[PDB]
């Protein structure tokens, strides 16, 4: 592994699109030392960086909600991890990975060992009307609804065997994104001081 999970201590923020990732996190870097990585920002910033040979491809699998391969997300999570932690940041909140089993091994394997899964168990039609809101205030390129069903398949059939391969390892903490942003805050709170 490049590290011993004393350096880094790494939480995968996992859920479906529109589950509430992003908001409980950004929440959570004001009250915690840790970094936020956000998986998808990661890739929509190699995409629309000038010389990336990647953009294209990363393009097509957002919009197509596909999962990026393994190759090209975990070097760009590798490297993001790399400049915190020489920047002297050793915690992390890792959010939207892994998102498929294959990213998941060679991340625990090469990179580091996880502490543990928050994951924000979610019912889809939750999820979606959350996302078509997003839709129309901030107007992301997938977050429209031919893309939110690939978003929606891609998630149960690639993304749910993550869950349920972490919770053979008893390291899942699932938290329900359906009460109001200050009500969910409260459980994530609650399961981070327990299980530190
Ligand atoms: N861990 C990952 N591996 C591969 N592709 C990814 C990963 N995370 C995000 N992506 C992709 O970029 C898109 C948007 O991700 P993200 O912004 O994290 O979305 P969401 O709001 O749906 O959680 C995904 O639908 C997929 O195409
Ligand atoms: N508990 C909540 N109730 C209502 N809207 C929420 C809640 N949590 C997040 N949202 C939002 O609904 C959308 C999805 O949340 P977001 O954090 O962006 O999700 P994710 O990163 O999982 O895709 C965003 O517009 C955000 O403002």
Do not use: W
Request: with cysteine.
């Amino acid at each position: 592994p490049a590290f011993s999970p004393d350096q880094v201590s790494v939480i995968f923020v996992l859920g479906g699109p529109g589950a509430g990732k992003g908001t409980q996190c950004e929440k959570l870097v004001k009250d915690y030392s840790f970094v936020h990585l956000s998986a998808g920002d990661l890739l929509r910033a190699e995409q629309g960086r000038a010389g990336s040979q990647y953009g294209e491809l990363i393009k097509n699998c957002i919009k197509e909600g596909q999962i990026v391969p393994q190759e090209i997300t975990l070097a760009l999570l590798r490297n993001a991890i790399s400049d915190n932690v020489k920047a002297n940041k050793h915690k992390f909140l890792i959010d939207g990975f892994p998102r498929k089993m294959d990213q998941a091994i060679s991340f625990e394997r090469d990179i580091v060992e996880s502490k543990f899964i928050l994951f924000f168990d979610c019912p889809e039609d939750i999820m979606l009307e959350r996302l078509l809101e997003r839709g129309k205030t901030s107007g992301r390129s997938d977050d429209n609804i031919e893309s939110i069903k690939k978003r929606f398949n891609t998630f149960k059939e690639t993304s749910m065997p993550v869950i349920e391969y972490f919770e053979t390892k008893s390291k899942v903490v699932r938290v329900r994104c359906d009460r109001s942003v200050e009500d969910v805050y409260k459980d994530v709170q609650d399961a981070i001081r327990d299980s530190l």
